[PDB]
mmCIF file of C-alpha atoms in Angstrom:
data_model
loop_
_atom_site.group_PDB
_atom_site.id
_atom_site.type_symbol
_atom_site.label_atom_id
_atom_site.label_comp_id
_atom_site.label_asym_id
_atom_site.label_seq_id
_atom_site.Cartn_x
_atom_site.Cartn_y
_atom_site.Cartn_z
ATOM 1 C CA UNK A 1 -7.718 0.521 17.265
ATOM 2 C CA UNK A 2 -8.568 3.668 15.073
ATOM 3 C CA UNK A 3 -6.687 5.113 11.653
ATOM 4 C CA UNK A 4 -5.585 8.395 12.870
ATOM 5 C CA UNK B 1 6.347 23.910 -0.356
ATOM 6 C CA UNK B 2 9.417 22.016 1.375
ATOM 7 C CA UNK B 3 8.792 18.797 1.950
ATOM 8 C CA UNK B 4 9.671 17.594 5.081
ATOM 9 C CA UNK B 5 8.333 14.367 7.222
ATOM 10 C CA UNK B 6 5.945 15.121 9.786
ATOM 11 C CA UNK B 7 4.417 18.267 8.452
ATOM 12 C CA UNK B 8 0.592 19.005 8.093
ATOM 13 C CA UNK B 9 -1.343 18.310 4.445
ATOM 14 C CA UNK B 10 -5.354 18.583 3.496
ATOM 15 C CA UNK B 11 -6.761 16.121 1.541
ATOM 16 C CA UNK B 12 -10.033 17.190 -1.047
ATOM 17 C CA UNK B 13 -9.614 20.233 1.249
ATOM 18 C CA UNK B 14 -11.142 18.173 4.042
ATOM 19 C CA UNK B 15 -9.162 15.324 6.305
ATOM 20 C CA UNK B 16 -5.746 16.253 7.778
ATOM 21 C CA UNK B 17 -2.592 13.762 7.677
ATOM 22 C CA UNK B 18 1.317 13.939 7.871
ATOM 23 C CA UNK B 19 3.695 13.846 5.403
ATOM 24 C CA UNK B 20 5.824 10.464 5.420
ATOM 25 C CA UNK B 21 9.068 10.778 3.858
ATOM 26 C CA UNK B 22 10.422 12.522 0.482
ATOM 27 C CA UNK B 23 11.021 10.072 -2.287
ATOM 28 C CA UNK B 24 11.551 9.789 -5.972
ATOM 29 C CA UNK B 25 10.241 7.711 -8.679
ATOM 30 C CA UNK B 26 12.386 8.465 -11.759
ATOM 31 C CA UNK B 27 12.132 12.237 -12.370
ATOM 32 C CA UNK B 28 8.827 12.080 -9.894
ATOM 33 C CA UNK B 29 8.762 13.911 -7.181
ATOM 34 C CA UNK B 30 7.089 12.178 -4.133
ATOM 35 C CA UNK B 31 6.219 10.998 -0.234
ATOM 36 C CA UNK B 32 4.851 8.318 0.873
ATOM 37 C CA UNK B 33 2.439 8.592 3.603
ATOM 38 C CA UNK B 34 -0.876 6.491 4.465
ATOM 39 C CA UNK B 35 -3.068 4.660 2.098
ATOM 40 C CA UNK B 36 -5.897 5.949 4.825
ATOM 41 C CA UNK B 37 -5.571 9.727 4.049
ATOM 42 C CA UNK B 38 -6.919 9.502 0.624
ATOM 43 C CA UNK B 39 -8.221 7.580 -2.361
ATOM 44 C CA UNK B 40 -6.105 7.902 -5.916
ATOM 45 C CA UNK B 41 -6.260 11.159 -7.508
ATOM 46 C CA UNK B 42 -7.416 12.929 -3.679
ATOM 47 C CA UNK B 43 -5.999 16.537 -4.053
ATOM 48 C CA UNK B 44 -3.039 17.278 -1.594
ATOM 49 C CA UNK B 45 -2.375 20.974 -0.163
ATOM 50 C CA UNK B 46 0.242 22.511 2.088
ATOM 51 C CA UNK B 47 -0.497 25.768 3.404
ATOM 52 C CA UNK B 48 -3.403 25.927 1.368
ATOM 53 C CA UNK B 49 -1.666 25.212 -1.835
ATOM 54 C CA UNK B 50 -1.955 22.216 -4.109
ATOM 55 C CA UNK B 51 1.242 20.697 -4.161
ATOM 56 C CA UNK B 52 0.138 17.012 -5.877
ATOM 57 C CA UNK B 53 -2.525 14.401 -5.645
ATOM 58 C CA UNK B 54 -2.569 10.529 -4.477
ATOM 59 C CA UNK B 55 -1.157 8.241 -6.838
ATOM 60 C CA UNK B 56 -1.647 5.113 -5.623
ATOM 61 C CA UNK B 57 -3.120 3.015 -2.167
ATOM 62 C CA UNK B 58 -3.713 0.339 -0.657
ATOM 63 C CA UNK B 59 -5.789 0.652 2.554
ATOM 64 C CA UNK B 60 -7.252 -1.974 4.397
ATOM 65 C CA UNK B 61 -5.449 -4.804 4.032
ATOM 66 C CA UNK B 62 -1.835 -2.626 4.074
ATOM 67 C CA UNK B 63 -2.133 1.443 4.949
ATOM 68 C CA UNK B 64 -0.199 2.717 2.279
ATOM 69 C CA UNK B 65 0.168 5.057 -0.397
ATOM 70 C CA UNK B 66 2.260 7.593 -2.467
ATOM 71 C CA UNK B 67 1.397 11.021 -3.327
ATOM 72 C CA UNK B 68 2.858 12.379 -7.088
ATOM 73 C CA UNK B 69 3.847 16.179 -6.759
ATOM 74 C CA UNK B 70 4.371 19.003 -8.951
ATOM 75 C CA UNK B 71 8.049 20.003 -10.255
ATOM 76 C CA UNK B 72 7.838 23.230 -8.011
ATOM 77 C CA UNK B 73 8.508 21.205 -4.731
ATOM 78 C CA UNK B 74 10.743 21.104 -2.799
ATOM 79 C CA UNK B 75 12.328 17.593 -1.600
ATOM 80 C CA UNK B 76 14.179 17.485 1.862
ATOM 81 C CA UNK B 77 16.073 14.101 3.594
ATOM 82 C CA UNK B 78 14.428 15.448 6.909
ATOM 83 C CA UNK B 79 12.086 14.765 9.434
ATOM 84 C CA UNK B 80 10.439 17.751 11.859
ATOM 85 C CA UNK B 81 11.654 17.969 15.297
ATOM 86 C CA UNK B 82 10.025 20.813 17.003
ATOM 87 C CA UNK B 83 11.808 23.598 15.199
ATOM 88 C CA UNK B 84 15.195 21.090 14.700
ATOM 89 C CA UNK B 85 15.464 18.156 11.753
ATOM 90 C CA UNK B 86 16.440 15.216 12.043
ATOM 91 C CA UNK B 87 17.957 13.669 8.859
ATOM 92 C CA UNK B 88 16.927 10.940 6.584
ATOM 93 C CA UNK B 89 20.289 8.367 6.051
ATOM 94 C CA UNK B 90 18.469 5.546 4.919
ATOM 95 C CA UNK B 91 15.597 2.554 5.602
ATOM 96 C CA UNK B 92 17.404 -0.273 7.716
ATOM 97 C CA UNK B 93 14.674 -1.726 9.600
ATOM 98 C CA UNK B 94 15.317 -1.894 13.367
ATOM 99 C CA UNK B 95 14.498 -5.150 15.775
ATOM 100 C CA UNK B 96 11.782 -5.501 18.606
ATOM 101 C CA UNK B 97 13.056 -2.982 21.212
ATOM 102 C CA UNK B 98 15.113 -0.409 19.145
ATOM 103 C CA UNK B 99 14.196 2.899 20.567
ATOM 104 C CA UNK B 100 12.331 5.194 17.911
ATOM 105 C CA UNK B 101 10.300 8.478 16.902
ATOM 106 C CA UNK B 102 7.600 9.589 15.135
ATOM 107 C CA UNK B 103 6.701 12.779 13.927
ATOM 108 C CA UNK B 104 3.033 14.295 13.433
ATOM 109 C CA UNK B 105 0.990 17.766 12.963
ATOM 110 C CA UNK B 106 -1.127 16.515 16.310
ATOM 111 C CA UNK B 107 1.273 15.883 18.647
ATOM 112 C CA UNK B 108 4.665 16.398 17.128
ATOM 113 C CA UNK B 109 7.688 14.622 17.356
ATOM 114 C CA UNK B 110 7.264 11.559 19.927
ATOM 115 C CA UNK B 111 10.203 8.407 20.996
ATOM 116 C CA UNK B 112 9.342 5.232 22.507
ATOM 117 C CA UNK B 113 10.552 1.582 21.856
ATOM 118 C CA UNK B 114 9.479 -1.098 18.988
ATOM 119 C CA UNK B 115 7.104 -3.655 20.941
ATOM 120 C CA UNK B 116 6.638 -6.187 18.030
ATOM 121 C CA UNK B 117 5.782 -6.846 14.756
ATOM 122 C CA UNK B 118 3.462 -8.092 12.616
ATOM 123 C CA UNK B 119 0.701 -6.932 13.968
ATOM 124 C CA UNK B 120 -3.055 -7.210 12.683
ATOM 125 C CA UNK B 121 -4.904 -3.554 13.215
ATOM 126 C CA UNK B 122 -8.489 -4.280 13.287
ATOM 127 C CA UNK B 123 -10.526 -0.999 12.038
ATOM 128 C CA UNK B 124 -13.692 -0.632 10.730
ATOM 129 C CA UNK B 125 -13.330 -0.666 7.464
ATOM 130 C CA UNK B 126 -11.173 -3.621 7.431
ATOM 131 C CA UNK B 127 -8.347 -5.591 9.029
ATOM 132 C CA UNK B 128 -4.651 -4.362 8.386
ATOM 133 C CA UNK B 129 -1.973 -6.454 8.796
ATOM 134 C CA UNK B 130 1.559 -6.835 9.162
ATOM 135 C CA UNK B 131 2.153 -3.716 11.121
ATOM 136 C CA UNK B 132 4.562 -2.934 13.943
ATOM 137 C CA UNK B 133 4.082 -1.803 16.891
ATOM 138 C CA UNK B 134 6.233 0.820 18.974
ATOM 139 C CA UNK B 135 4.909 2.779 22.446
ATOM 140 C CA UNK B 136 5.752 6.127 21.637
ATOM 141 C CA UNK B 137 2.441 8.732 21.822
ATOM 142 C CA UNK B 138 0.091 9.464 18.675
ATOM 143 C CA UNK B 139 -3.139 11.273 18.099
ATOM 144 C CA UNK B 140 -6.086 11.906 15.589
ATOM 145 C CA UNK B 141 -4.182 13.930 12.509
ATOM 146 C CA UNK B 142 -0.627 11.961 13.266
ATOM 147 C CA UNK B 143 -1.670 9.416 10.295
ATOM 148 C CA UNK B 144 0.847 9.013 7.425
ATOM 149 C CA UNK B 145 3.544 10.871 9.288
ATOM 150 C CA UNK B 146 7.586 9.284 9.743
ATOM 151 C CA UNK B 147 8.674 6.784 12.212
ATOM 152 C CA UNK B 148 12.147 7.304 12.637
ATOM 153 C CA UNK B 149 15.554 6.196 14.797
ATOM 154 C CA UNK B 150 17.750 9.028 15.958
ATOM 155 C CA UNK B 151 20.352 7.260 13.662
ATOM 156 C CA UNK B 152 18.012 8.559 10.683
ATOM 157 C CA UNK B 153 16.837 4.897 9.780
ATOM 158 C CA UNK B 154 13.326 5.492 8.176
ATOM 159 C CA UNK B 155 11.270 2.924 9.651
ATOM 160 C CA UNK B 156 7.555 3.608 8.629
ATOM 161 C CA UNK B 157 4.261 5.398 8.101
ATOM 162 C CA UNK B 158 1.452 6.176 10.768
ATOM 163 C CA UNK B 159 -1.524 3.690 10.791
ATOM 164 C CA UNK B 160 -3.648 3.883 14.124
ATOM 165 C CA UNK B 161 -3.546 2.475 17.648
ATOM 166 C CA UNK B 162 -5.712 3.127 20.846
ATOM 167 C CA UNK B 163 -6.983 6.512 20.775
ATOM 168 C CA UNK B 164 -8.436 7.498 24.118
ATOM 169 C CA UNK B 165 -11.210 10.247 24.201
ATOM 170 C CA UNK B 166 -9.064 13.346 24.073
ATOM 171 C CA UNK B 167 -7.965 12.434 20.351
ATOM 172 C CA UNK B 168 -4.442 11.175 21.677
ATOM 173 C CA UNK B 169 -2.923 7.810 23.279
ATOM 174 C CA UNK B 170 -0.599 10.603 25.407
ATOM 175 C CA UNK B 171 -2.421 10.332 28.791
ATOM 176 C CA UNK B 172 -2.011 6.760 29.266
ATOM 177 C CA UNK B 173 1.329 5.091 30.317
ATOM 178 C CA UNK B 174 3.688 3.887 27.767
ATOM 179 C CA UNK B 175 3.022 -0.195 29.061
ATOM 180 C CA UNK B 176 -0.422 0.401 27.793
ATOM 181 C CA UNK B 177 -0.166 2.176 24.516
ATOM 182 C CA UNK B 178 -0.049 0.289 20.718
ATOM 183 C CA UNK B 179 0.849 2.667 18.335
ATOM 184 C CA UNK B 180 0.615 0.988 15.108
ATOM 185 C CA UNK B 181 2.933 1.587 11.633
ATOM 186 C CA UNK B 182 2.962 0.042 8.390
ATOM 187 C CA UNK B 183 6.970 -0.412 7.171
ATOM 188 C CA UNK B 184 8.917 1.505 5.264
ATOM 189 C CA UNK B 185 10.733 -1.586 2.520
ATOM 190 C CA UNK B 186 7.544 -2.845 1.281
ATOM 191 C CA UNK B 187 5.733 0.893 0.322
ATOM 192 C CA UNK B 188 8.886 1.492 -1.587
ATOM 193 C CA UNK B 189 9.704 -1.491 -3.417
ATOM 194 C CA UNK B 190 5.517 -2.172 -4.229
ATOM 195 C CA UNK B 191 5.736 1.713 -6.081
ATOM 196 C CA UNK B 192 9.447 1.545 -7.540
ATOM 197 C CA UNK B 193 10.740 4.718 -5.295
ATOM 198 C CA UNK B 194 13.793 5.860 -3.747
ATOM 199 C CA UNK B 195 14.086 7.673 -0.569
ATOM 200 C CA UNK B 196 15.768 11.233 -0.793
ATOM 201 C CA UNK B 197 18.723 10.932 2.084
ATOM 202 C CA UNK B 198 21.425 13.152 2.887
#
């Protein structure tokens, strides 16, 4: 999971 | 500028994110958006135009934050829809399979279903917690923009979730995406605002  | 949820702002004239939702804090004009996008006191533009800077965050940990604007904007209950609105009536949180939508300068306005809650994001710079998850589409830029039921039920703000390599969890089916957004009640009563609805 990545910001976006 | 009008402020409307999902539309494009800079940040120190460098990262992009999305507008959240319009919201007040006493006579202060506001929108809430994510605590990513920029540290307190980041300059905000729209269209190349400063319209107010971040006044508070919290990011990792939560993915929150508010940014204070100038008298000059504009506040709007809406939420972009392609070229159509949809309007903000309120924050009622929906349950685990509530259909909803988000809206985003990458890939625009996206629907899917809520696939559970309380979900711990874990990024580089720190876990995030507590967010919910729904299966509708997102991409690099989306961050900070409105999650939102066709009913107009605010929901949330943009965190993260699986990004592929093109920028975008679009190209994979909906069974396999996690789109990830921090809730709506919490951002507003942590900063004291109200949510312009009409």
């Amino acid at each position: 999971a990545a910001p976006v | 500028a009008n402020i409307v949820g999902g539309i494009e702002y800079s940040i120190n004239n460098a990262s992009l994110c999305s507008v959240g939702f319009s919201v007040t804090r006493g006579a202060t004009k506001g929108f809430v958006t994510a605590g990513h996008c920029g540290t307190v006191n980041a300059t905000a533009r729209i269209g190349g135009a400063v319209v107010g800077t971040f006044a508070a965050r919290v990011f990792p940990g939560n993915d929150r934050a508010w940014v204070s604007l100038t008298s000059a904007q504009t506040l709007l209950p809406r939420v972009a829809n392609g070229s159509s609105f949809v309007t903000v009536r309120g924050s009622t949180e929906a349950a685990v399979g509530a259909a909803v939508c988000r809206s985003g300068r990458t890939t625009g306005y996206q629907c899917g279903t809520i696939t559970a809650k309380n979900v711990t994001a874990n990024y580089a710079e720190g876990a995030v917690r507590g967010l919910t998850q729904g299966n509708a589409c997102m991409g690099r830029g989306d961050s900070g923009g409105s999650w939102i039921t066709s009913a107009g039920q605010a929901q949330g703000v943009m965190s993260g979730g699986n990004v592929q390599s093109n920028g975008n969890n679009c190209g994979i089916p909906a069974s396999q995406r996690s789109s990830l957004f921090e809730r709506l009640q919490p951002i507003l009563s942590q900063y004291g605002l109200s949510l312009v609805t009409g």
